[PDB]
Structures are given as C-alpha cells and as structure tokens.
Amino acid sequence: EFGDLSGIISRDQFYKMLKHMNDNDCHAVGFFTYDAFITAAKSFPSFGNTGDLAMRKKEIAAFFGQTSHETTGGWSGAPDGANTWGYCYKEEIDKSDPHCDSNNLEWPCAPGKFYYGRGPMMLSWNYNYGPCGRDLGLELLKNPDVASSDPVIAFKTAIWFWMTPQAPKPSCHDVITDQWEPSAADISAGRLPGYGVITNIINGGLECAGRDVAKVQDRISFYTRYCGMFGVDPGSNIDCDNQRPFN
Numbered sequence: 001e002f003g004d005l006s007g008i009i010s011r012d013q014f015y016k017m018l019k020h021m022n023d024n025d026c027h028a029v030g031f032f033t034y035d036a037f038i039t040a041a042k043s044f045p046s047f048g049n050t051g052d053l054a055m056r057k058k059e060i061a062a063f064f065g066q067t068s069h070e071t072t073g074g075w076s077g078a079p080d081g082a083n084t085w086g087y088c089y090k091e092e093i094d095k096s097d098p099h100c101d102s103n104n105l106e107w108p109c110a111p112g113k114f115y116y117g118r119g120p121m122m123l124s125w126n127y128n129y130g131p132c133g134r135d136l137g138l139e140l141l142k143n144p145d146v147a148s149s150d151p152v153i154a155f156k157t158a159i160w161f162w163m164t165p166q167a168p169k170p171s172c173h174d175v176i177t178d179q180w181e182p183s184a185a186d187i188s189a190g191r192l193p194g195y196g197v198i199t200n201i202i203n204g205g206l207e208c209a210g211r212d213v214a215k216v217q218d219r220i221s222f223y224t225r226y227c228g229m230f231g232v233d234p235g236s237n238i239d240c241d242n243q244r245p246f247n
C-alpha cells in the first residue's frame with residue numbers, strides 16, 4: 001500500500017476541504033473525486049510520502065492550496081468563505097487561445113487542438129502537454145482534452161507538474177519537502193524556501209513582487225486553512241511580495 005495516501009487523508013477531509021465543488025453553483029460537479037486523487041497519487045510514490053508524518057501532510061496541504069486557487073469559484077463573502085470554493089472549475093473559462101509556442105521544436109502543436117488550462121494545476125501550453133504526455137505514457141499533445149474528461153488523468157497532470165523541475169525552477173515537491181537548496185542568485189532574488197517560492201514557480205511573473213497581491217493572498221488563504229485542518233505548521237516565507245520572479 002506504499003504510495004496510497006488514504007491513511008493520511010480521508011474522504012471526510014477531502015470533501016470538507018472541497019466542500020463546495022459538488023454544489024450546483026460550481027462547474028465540474030462530481031468530476032474530481034477522492035478515488036481519482038488517490039489513484040493519481042500512486043503514480044508518483046514520493047508525493048505525500050517524503051519526510052515524517054507532518055511533512056507528508058504539509059505537502060498535501062500545499063498541493064491542495066495551490067490547485068484550489070487555480071480552480072477556485074470563490075468570491076468576497078461566499079458561503080463559508082472564499083477559501084472553501086476550490087475545485088469549482090476543471091478547465092480554463094476562456095478557451096479561445098490554443099496556447100501554442102511554435103518556436104519549441106520537440107512538442108509540435110496538433111491541428112485544431114487547444115492547450116489552454118486543464119485540471120487542478122490548469123496545465124497549459126504545448127511545451128507542458130508534450131513532456132507531461134511523454135512522462136505519463138499518454139498522447140496529450142494529440143488529445144489534450146483527455147485532461148478534462150478523465151479525472152485520474154486530470155490529477156496526474158497536476159501531480160506531474162508538482163513533481164517536475166523546469167530549469168531554472170525547482171519542483172514544488174522539492175521546495176515543500178526541504179530538498180531545494182537555493183543558489184546564491186535565488187537568495188539575491190529573495191527566493192527563500194517556502195510556499196511563497198511555490199507561488200513563484202506556478203505564476204510568479206504575474207503575481208509575485210507585488211504584481212497581484214489579491215491572487216497571492218487567495219493561494220495563502222486556502223493553504224493556511226488546509227494546514228489548520230491537518231494540524232501542521234505552514235512554514236516560513238509563505239508570501240512572495242518580496243521575491244523576484246524566476247527568469
């Protein structure tokens with residue numbers, strides 16, 4: 001059963017965290033399931049299985065904090081608070097942009113396919129769908145919409161993103177599990193290990209260094225709620241308002 005996370009996160013906890021995603025007011029009702037999450041996680045053994053018990057729970061809280069924001073349907077004064085509205089969407093609302101970078105040569109854009117955000121991490125662009133597909137043994141470049149029709153695949157794309165360094169960025173996994181050693185240049189950029197660097201990895205060019213404080217605070221609000229629920233310390237350097245984005 002190693003790699004099965006059901007011993008440290010229960011259905012009760014999963015659906016309490018995501019208490020509105022199955023509400024009629026959300027847009028992917030019944031799509032994201034606890035079983036789909038557990039199955040996806042088995043494909044990435046070290047996810048949720050690195051460190052002591054508290055570290056394992058912290059990683060789960062961080063992953064759900066970030067993916068909850070990517071998928072949020074929250075608003076100011078939402079029932080039970082905006083930090084209860086994660087997983088309200090399974091794909092990007094605006095589907096008009098193919099997100100094709102034709103200058104990349106390894107991952108050709110398939111005709112008529114769109115690489116807009118899908119899944120918990122809102123995976124985007126041919127240059128992410130390509131290597132993700134390669135790594136999962138799936139044809140995601142040719143069939144990107146499987147990432148929004150199969151919940152196991154949807155979660156796998158999100159965990160893949162979480163586990164995968166993309167130079168110069170380390171993996172989110174490495175940051176949250178105290179396995180990332182910042183370079184002297186990272187230190188000069190204010191990028192000290194914590195949830196803040198994770199926000200920076202995901203969308204720092206548009207949100208960090210004070211560029212979108214509201215979005216960053218939303219990411220923090222989910223994470224702190226989830227940490228409180230698991231009873232774990234969220235760690236230091238939770239914000240990224242004094243970090244420079246990665247280059």
Ligand SMILES: [Cl-]
Pocket residue numbers: 010011012
């Ligand atoms: Cl259960």
Ligand SMILES: [Cl-]
Pocket residue numbers: 022023024029
């Ligand atoms: Cl419904």
Ligand SMILES: [Cl-]
Pocket residue numbers: 043044045046047
């Ligand atoms: Cl792994």
Ligand SMILES: [Cl-]
Pocket residue numbers: 003045
């Ligand atoms: Cl295994």
Ligand SMILES: [Cl-]
Pocket residue numbers: 048049050
């Ligand atoms: Cl373990």
Ligand SMILES: [Cl-]
Pocket residue numbers: 069072
């Ligand atoms: Cl938003």
Ligand SMILES: [Cl-]
Pocket residue numbers: 025073
């Ligand atoms: Cl809504």
Ligand SMILES: [Cl-]
Pocket residue numbers: 075076077078081082083
């Ligand atoms: Cl609120």
Ligand SMILES: [Cl-]
Pocket residue numbers: 027028088089090091
């Ligand atoms: Cl949706």
Ligand SMILES: [Cl-]
Pocket residue numbers: 112113114115144145
């Ligand atoms: Cl498509």
Ligand SMILES: [Cl-]
Pocket residue numbers: 192193236237
């Ligand atoms: Cl520090």
Ligand SMILES: [Cl-]
Pocket residue numbers: 214215218
């Ligand atoms: Cl937001």
